[PDB]
Short mmCIF file of C-alpha atoms and ligand atoms in Angstrom, two decimals:
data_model
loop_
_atom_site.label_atom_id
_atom_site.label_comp_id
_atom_site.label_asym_id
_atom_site.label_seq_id
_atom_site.Cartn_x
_atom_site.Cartn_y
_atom_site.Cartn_z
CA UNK A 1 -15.78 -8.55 3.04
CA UNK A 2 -16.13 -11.55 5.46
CA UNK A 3 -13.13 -12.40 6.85
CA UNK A 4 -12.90 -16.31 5.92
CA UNK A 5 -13.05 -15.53 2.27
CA UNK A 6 -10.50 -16.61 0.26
CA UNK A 7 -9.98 -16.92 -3.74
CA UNK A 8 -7.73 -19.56 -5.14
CA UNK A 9 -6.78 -19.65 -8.67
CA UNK A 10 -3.91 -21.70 -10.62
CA UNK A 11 -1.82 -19.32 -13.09
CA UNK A 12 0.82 -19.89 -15.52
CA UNK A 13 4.61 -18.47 -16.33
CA UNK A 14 7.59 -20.14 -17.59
CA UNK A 15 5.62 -23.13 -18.33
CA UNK A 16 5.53 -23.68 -14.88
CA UNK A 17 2.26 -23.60 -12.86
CA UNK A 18 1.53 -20.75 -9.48
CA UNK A 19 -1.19 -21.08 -7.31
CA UNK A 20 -2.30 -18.12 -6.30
CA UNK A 21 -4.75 -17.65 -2.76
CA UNK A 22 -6.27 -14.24 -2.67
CA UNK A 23 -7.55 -12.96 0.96
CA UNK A 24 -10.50 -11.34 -0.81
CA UNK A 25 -11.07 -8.79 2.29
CA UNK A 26 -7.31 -7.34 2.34
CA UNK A 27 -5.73 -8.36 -0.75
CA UNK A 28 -3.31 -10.47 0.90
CA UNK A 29 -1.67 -13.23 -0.78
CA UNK A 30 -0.01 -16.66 -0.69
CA UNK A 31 1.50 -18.33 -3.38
CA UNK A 32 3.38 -20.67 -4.41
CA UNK A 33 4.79 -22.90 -7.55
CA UNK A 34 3.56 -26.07 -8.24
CA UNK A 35 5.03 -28.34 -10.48
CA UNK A 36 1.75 -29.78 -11.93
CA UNK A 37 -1.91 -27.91 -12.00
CA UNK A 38 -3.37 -31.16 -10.45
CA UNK A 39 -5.87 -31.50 -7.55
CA UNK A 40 -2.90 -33.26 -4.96
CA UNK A 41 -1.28 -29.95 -5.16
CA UNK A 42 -4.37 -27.97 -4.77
CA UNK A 43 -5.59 -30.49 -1.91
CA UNK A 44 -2.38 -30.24 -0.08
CA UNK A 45 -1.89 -25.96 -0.54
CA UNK A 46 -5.28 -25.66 0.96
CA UNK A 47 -4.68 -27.82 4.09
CA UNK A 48 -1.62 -25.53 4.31
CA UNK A 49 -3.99 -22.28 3.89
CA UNK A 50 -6.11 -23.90 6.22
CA UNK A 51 -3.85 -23.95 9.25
CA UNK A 52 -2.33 -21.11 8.75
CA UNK A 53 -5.14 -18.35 8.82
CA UNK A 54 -9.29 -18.92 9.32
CA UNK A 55 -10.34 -20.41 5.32
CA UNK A 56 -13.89 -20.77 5.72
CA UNK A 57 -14.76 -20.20 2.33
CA UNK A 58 -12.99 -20.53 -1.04
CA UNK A 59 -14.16 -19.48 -4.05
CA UNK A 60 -12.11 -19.67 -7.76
CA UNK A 61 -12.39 -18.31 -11.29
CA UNK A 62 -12.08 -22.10 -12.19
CA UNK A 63 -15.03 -24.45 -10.55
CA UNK A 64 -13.29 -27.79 -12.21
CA UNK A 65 -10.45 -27.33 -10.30
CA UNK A 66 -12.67 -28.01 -7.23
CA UNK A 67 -14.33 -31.21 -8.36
CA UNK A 68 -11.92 -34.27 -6.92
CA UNK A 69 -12.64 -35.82 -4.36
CA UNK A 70 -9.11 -35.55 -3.45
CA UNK A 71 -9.58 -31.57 -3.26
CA UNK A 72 -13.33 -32.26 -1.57
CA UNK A 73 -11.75 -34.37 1.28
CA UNK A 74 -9.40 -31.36 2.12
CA UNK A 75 -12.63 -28.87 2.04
CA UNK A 76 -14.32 -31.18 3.83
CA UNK A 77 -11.20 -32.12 6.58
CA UNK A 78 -10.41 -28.72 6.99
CA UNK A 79 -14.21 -27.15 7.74
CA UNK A 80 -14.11 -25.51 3.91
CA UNK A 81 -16.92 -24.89 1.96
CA UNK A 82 -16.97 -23.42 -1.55
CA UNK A 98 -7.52 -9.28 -11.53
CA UNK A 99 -4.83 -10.12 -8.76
CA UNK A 100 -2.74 -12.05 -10.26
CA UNK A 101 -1.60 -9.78 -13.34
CA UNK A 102 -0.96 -7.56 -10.23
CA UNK A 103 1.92 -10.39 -9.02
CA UNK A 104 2.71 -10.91 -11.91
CA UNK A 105 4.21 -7.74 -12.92
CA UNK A 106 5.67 -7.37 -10.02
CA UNK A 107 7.58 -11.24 -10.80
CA UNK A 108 8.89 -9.32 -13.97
CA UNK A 109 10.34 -6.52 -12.17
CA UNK A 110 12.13 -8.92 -9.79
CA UNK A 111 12.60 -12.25 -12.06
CA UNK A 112 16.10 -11.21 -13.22
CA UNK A 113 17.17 -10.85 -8.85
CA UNK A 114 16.76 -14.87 -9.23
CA UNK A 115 17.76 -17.80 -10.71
CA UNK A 116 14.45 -20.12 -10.05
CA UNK A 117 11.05 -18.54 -10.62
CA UNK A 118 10.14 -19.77 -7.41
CA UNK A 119 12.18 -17.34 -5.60
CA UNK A 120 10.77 -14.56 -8.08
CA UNK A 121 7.18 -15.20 -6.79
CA UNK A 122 7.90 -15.55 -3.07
CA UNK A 123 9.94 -11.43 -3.70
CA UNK A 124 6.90 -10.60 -5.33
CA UNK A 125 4.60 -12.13 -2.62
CA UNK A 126 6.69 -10.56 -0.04
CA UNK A 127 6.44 -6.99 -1.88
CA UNK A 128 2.73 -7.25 -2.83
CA UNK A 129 2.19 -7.99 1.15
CA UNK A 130 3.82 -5.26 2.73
CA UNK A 131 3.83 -2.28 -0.07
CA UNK A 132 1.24 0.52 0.82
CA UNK A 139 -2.53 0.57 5.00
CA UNK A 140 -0.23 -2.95 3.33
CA UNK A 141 -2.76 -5.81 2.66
CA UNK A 142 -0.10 -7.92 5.79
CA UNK A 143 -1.74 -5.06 7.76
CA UNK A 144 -5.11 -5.06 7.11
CA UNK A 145 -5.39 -9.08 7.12
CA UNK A 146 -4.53 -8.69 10.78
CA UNK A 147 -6.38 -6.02 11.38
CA UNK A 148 -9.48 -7.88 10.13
CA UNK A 149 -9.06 -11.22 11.54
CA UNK A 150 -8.49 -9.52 14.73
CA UNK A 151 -11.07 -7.74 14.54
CA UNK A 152 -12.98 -10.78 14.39
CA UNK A 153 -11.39 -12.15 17.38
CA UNK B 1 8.48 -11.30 22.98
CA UNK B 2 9.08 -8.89 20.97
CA UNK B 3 6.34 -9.45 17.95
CA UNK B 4 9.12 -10.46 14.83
CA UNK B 5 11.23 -12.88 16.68
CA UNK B 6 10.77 -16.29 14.98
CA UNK B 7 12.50 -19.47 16.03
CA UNK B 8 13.13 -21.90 12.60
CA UNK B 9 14.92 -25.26 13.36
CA UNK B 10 14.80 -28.27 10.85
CA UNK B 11 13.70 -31.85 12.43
CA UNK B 12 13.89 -35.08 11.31
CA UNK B 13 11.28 -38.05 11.01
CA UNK B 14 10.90 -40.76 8.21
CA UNK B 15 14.12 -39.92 6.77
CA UNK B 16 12.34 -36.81 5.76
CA UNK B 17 13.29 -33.04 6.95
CA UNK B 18 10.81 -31.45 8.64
CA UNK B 19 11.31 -27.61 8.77
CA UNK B 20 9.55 -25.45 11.69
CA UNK B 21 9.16 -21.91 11.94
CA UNK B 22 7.86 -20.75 15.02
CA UNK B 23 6.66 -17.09 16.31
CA UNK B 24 8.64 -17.14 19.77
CA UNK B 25 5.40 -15.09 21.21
CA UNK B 26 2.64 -16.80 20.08
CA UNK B 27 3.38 -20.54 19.48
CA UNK B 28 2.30 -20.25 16.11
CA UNK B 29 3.48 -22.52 13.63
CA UNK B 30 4.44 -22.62 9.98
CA UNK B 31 6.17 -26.11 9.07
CA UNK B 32 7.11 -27.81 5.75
CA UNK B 33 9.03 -31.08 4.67
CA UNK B 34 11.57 -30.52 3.08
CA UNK B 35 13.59 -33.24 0.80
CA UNK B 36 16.99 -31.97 1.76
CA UNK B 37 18.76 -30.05 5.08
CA UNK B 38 20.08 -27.65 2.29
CA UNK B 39 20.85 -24.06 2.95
CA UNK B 40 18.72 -23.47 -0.24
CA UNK B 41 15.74 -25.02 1.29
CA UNK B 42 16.68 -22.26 4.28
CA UNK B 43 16.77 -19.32 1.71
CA UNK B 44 13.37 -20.11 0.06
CA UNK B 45 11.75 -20.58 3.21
CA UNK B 46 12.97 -17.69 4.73
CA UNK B 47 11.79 -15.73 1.84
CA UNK B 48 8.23 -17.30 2.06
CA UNK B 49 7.62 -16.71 5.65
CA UNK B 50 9.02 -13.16 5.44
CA UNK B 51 6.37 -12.24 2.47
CA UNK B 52 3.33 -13.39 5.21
CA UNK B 53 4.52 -12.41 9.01
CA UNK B 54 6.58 -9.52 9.74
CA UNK B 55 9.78 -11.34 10.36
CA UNK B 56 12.74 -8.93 12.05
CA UNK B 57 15.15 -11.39 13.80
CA UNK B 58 15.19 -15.13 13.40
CA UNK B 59 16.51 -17.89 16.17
CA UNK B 60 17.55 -21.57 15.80
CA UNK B 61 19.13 -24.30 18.03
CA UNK B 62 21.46 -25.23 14.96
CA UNK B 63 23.68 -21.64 14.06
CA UNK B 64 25.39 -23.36 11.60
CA UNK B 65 22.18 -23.30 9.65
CA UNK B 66 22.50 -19.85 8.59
CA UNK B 67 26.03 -19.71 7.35
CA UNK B 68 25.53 -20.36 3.89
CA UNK B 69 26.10 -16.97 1.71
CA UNK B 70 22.60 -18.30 0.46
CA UNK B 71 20.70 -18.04 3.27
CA UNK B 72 22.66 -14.81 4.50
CA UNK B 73 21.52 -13.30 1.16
CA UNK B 74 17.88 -14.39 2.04
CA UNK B 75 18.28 -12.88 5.76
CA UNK B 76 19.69 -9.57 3.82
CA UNK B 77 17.25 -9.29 0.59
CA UNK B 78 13.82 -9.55 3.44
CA UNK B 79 15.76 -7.48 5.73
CA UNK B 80 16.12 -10.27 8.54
CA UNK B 81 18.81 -10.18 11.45
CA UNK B 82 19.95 -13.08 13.75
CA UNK B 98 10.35 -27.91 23.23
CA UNK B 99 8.00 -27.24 20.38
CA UNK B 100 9.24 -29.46 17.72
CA UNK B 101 7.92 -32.68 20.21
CA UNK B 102 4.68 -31.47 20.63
CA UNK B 103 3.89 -31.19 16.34
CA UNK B 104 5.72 -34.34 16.08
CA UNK B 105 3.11 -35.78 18.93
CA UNK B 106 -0.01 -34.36 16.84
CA UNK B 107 1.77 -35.95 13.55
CA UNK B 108 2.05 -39.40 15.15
CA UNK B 109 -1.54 -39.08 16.33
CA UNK B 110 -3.23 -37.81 12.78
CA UNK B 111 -0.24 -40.16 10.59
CA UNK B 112 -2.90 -42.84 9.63
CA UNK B 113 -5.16 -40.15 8.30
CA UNK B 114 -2.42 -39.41 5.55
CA UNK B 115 -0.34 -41.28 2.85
CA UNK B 116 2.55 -38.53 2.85
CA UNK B 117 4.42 -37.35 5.69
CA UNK B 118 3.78 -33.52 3.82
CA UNK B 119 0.43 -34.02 3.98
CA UNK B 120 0.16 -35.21 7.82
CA UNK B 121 2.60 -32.26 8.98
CA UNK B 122 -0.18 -29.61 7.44
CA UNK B 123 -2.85 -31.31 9.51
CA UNK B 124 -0.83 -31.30 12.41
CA UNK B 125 -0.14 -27.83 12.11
CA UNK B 126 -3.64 -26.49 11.65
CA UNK B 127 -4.61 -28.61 14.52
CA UNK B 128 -1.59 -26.83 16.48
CA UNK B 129 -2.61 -23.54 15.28
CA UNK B 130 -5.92 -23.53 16.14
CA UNK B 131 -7.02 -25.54 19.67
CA UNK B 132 -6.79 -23.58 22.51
CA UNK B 139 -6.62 -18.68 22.81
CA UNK B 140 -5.29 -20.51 19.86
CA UNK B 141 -1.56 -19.95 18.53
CA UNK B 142 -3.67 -18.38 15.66
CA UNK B 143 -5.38 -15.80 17.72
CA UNK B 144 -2.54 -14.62 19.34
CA UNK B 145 -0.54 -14.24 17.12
CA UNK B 146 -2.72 -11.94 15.29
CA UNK B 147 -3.53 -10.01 17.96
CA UNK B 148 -0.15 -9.69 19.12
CA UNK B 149 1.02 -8.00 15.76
CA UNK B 150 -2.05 -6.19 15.12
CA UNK B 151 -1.72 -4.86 18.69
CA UNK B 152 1.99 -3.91 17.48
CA UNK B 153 -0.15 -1.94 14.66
C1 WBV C 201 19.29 -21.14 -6.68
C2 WBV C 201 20.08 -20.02 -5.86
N1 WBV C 201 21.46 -20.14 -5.70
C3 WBV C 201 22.21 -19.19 -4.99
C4 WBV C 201 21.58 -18.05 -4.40
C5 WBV C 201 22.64 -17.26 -3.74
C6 WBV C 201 22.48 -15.88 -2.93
C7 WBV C 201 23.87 -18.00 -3.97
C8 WBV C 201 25.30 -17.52 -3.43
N2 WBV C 201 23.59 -19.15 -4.71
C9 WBV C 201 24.58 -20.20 -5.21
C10 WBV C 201 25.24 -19.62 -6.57
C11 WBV C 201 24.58 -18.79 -7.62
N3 WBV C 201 25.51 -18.52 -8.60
N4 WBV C 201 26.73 -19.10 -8.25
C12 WBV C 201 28.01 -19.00 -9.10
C13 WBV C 201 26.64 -19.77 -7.05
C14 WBV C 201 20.14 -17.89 -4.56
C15 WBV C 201 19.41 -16.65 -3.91
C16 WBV C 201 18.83 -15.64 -4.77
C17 WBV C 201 18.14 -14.54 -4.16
C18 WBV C 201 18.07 -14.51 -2.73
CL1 WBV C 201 17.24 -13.12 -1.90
C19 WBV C 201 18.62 -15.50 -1.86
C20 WBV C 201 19.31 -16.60 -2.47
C21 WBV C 201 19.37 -18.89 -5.30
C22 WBV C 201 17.87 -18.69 -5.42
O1 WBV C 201 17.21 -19.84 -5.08
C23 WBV C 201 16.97 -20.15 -3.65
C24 WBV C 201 15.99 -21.41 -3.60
C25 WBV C 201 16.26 -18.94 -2.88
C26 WBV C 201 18.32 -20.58 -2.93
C27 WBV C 201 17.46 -18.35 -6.77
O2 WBV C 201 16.38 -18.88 -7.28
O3 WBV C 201 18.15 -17.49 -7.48
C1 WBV C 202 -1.80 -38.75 -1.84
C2 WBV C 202 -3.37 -38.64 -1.57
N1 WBV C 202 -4.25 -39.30 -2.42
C3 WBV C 202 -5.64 -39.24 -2.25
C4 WBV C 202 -6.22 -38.48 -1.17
C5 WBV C 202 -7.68 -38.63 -1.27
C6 WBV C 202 -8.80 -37.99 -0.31
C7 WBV C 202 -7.91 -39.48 -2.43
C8 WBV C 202 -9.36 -39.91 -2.93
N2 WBV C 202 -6.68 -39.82 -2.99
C9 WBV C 202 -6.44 -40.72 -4.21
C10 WBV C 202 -6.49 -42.25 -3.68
C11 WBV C 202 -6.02 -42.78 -2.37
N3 WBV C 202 -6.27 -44.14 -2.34
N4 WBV C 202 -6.88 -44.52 -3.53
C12 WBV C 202 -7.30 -45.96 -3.87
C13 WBV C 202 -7.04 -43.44 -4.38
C14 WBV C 202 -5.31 -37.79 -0.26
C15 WBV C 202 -5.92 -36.93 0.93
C16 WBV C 202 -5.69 -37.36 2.29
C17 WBV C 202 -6.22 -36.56 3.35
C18 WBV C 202 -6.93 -35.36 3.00
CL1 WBV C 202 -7.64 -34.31 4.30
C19 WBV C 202 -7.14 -34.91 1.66
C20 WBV C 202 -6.62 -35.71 0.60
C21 WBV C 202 -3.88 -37.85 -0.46
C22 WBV C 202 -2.98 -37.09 0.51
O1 WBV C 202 -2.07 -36.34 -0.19
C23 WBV C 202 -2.46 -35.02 -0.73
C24 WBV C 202 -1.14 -34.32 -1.26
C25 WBV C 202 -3.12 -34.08 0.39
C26 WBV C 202 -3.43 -35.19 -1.98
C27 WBV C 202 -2.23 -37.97 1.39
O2 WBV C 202 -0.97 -37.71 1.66
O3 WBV C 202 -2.80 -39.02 1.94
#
């Protein structure tokens, strides 16, 4: 697929809220845990996204979640413009009881989902290089 | 350099921590504020930026850092061994009035580090896709 695509989508576990970015190309994801599903923290994750690889387009299993203009101003300061996670989160299970905080648990699991096997850490810099 | 070697120091502005990760070969940057210099804060970074970059052997200016049994354990579960910081702070000060929160002015100034020019991004890409 293009290589700016991403997917962003806001899941839940432990009554605690991860956000989930999907490279939809390689499979490669970042996530983290947010304390609240509110548009600040989805605002703020993109501009991190954002810097951090080429997001040129997002797209979500949610639309609402795009819809403040708090969330807009980050598309629109960043050059955006508008399955998986059962996948992470079995793989949170099999490490949730190597950690205290499920925060650790989803940064194991990001950091196994990356580089297991071509890994999807692999083939996101194959493709973006690629690009380049 | 050798395409794993990251240099991670914590820095200090607004009474806030400011911790940098940066890929020795590139220039690329991955930076977060933090609310405390904790070795915990270490730990869960560590893990983070190990699940997205290949990340063999990690540097700092501060070796005390990494003495916590906490962070040790992060260096040992991702499989991690043992100048710039004035140039983000320069791109925060210049982008600060564009942002409320420090956090939110730090991710601008990174993507704007990442990206101008090759870019920090690009190389670093190409660097460890090359290493592919
Ligand atoms: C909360 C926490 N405290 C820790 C550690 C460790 C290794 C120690 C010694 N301590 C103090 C302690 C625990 N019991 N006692 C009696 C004293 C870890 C940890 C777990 C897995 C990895 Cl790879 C690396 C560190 C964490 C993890 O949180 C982060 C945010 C990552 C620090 C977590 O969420 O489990
Ligand atoms: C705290 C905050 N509130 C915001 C926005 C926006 C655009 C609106 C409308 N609001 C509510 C508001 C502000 N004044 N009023 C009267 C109502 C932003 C922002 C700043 C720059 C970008 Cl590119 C994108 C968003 C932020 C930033 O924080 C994050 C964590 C990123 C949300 C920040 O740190 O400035």
């Amino acid at each position: 697929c293009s290589p700016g695509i991403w997917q962003l989508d806001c899941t839940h576990l432990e009554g605690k809220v991860i956000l989930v970015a999907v490279h939809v190309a390689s499979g490669y994801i970042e996530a983290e845990v947010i304390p609240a599903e509110t548009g600040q923290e989805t605002a703020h994750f993109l501009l991190k996204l954002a810097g951090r690889w080429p997001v040129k387009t997002v797209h979500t299993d949610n639309g609402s979640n795009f819809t403040s203009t708090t969330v807009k101003t980050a598309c629109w300061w960043a050059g955006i413009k508008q399955s998986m996670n059962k996948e992470l989160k079995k793989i949170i299970g099999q490490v949730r009881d190597q950690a205290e905080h499920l925060k650790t648990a989803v940064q194991m699991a990001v950091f196994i989902h990356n580089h297991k096997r071509y890994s999807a850490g692999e083939r996101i810099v194959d493709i973006i290089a690629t690009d380049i």
